[PDB]
C-alpha cells in the first residue's frame, strides 16, 4: 500500500480514510507501550486491519509497582552518574529527520543491526543478588510460576529479601516520610477547606 494507483485500491482507500477517527486511539496505545530506558527493544502485540489501514498496539503496559519504582530509581542513579562524568553531552537535533525523506523502512535499515546497550545500573552482586538476574527484563519474572500468577502478569507476590532489595534501590524515588503528622495542615482535607 505504498503506491495506491490501481483501481483495486479503491476500496482500501476508503478503509484508510474511515480509519482516521480511530487514529487517536492508535497513538495512545503506541505511546503507552513505549520502551523504558532499560530496554533495547520491545515486542508488542498488535491488531491490524487486513488492508493495512490502521495498526493498534493490542497490549496494556502493566508493571509491578515496587519493581517499576526500583527500575526508574536505578536509571535515576545511572543518569546522575552519567551527567557527572561526561565531558560533553550532545543533545540530539529535533526533528531527527528532514521532512523530505520518507520514514525509512524497518527491515532494510533497522532490523539487521545489533541494537545498543540500554541504561542499566551495574547492580553490585553482593548487595543486589536477589534482583540482579531479573530487574531489567521486559516483563520481570513473567514466567516464574511462584512470583507471579503467569504470563497474564497479574497479582505478584514476593519474599522478604527481594522486597527489601527493591526497597533499597528505590531510595532516590521513595516517599522518605513515615509519620502522618508531617501532613498536618497539608493534606487534601485542609486543601479543600
Amino acid at each position: 500500500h505504498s503506491d495506491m494507483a490501481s483501481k483495486m485500491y479503491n476500496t482500501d482507500k476508503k478503509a484508510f480514510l474511515g480509519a482516521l477517527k480511530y487514529l487517536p486511539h492508535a497513538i495512545l496505545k503506541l505511546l503507552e507501550n513505549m520502551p523504558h530506558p532499560w530496554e533495547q527493544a520491545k515486542e508488542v502485540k498488535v491488531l491490524y486491519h487486513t488492508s493495512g489501514a490502521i495498526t493498534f498496539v493490542n497490549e496494556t503496559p502493566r508493571v509491578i509497582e515496587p519493581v517499576y519504582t526500583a527500575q526508574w530509581s536505578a536509571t535515576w542513579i545511572a543518569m546522575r552518574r552519567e551527567k557527572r562524568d561526561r565531558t560533553h553531552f550532545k543533545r540530539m537535533r529535533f526533528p531527527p529527520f528532514d521532512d523530505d525523506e520518507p520514514p525509512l523502512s524497518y527491515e532494510q535499515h533497522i532490523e539487521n543491526i545489533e541494537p545498543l546497550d540500554p541504561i542499566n545500573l551495574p547492580l553490585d552482586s553482593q548487595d543486589d543478588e536477589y534482583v540482579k538476574d531479573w530487574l531489567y527484563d521486559s516483563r520481570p519474572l513473567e514466567e516464574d510460576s511462584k512470583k507471579v500468577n503467569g504470563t497474564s502478569y497479574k497479582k505478584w507476590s514476593f519474599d522478604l529479601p527481594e522486597m527489601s532489595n527493591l526497597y533499597r534501590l528505590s531510595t532516590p524515588l521513595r516517599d522518605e516520610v513515615t509519620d502522618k503528622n508531617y501532613y498536618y495542615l497539608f493534606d487534601k482535607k485542609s486543601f479543600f477547606n
Binding site: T11, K14, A15, G18, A19, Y22, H49, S51, A53, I54
Partner: protein, 50 residues
C-alpha cells in the same frame, strides 16, 4: 422458496450505509379523496369601513 435472510458482517472502517447520501427529494401528494370544506352559508353586509 424458503429463503433465509442474514446480515453481512460490515467492515468497521468502510462507511456503513454505502447508498446513504445527503440528497434532497421533493415528494408527491397522494390525493385520492377530496376533503369537503364544510363552512356554513353566508351577516354578510358590509360598508366601506374596512
Amino acid at each position: 422458496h424458503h429463503i433465509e435472510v442474514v446480515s453481512k458482517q460490515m467492515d468497521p472502517l468502510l462507511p456503513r450505509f454505502v447508498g446513504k447520501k445527503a440528497r434532497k427529494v421533493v415528494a408527491p401528494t397522494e390525493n385520492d379523496e377530496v376533503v369537503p370544506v364544510l363552512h356554513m352559508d353566508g351577516g354578510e353586509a358590509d360598508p366601506n369601513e374596512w
